[PDB]
């Protein structure tokens, strides 16, 4: 749904 | 009680909370993005997770409260109100959506990673206006 | 606490997991209050004790950990590591009296359990060094 920015 | 943890440490958290938001596990992916802007309260990233979240359980005024911050946080981010625009029109809120996904058009046409949001953004501002009209 | 109550099964292990990691990494601080919050946030499980009473061994904090490794002792009868460690703190903290029983209990219970049939002689030759 909501694309969130990727971690590490 | 979790108060003062390293950058490194926040981040191996952040990338919790995405990895559970990921999987579909929306309440455990809150819990932790709500800890985050707890621990950082200028991180948009962590307001962008806890509205995601909310959003994707139904719970569109406190996911309006999360994006509404975050976006005072990244005042070039086309996310925090485009999914505010969502958030507005499962609410019934036409003029609220109206406004979400016009601003969400403008910040995303400004930057190139964000080109499919941009059209995405025109998309659902001119399916708005079309049930306003 | 309060809010990150109630977390599934498999994100209490992935924090546990983290916790670990940064305690293998050095970062002791931010593995204590990841522990502690273990401690606190779900039912008893070994491994949050030991782990936090570790942290605290490395940050010379000996009768914090003393406290985690005796709740843990209280709530797991047959783990040796409980005494062990604790003895290990009472020695720092110079009390043999102390030492000498966990170690003495440590030993007794490895005996007992053929996974820490090593473990029973790091309790038996550290014994020997106290009653001395």
Same mark, same amino acid.
């Given at each position: 749904?909501?694309?969130?920015?990727?971690?590490? | 009680?979790?108060?003062?943890?390293?950058?490194?440490?926040?981040?191996?958290?952040?990338?919790?909370?995405?990895?559970?938001?990921?999987?579909? %596990?929306?309440?455990?992916?809150? %819990? =932790?993005?709500?800890?985050?802007?707890?621990?950082?309260?200028?991180?948009?990233?962590?307001?962008?997770?806890?509205?995601?979240?909310?959003?994707? /359980?139904?719970? &569109?005024?406190?996911? /309006?409260?999360?994006?509404? &911050?975050?976006?005072?946080?990244? =005042?070039?981010?086309?996310?925090?109100?485009?999914? @505010?625009?969502?958030?507005?029109?499962?609410?019934?809120? /036409?003029?609220?959506?109206?406004?979400?996904? &016009?601003?969400?058009?403008?910040?995303?046409?400004?930057?190139?990673?964000?080109?499919? /949001?941009?059209?995405?953004?025109?998309?659902?501002?001119?399916?708005?206006? @079309?049930? %306003?009209?």
């Amino acid at each position: 749904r909501v694309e969130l920015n990727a971690p590490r | 009680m979790l108060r003062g943890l390293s950058e490194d440490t926040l981040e191996q958290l952040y990338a919790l909370g995405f990895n559970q938001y990921q999987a579909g %596990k929306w309440d455990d992916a809150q %819990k =932790i993005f709500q800890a985050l802007c707890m621990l950082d309260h200028y991180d948009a990233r962590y307001f962008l997770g806890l509205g995601a979240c909310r959003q994707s /359980l139904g719970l &569109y005024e406190q996911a /309006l409260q999360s994006y509404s &911050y975050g976006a005072l946080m990244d =005042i070039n981010e086309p996310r925090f109100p485009f999914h @505010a625009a969502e958030c507005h029109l499962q609410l019934g809120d /036409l003029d609220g959506a109206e406004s979400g996904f &016009y601003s969400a058009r403008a910040l995303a046409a400004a930057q190139p990673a964000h080109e499919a /949001l941009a059209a995405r953004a025109g998309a659902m501002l001119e399916a708005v206006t @079309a049930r %306003k009209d």
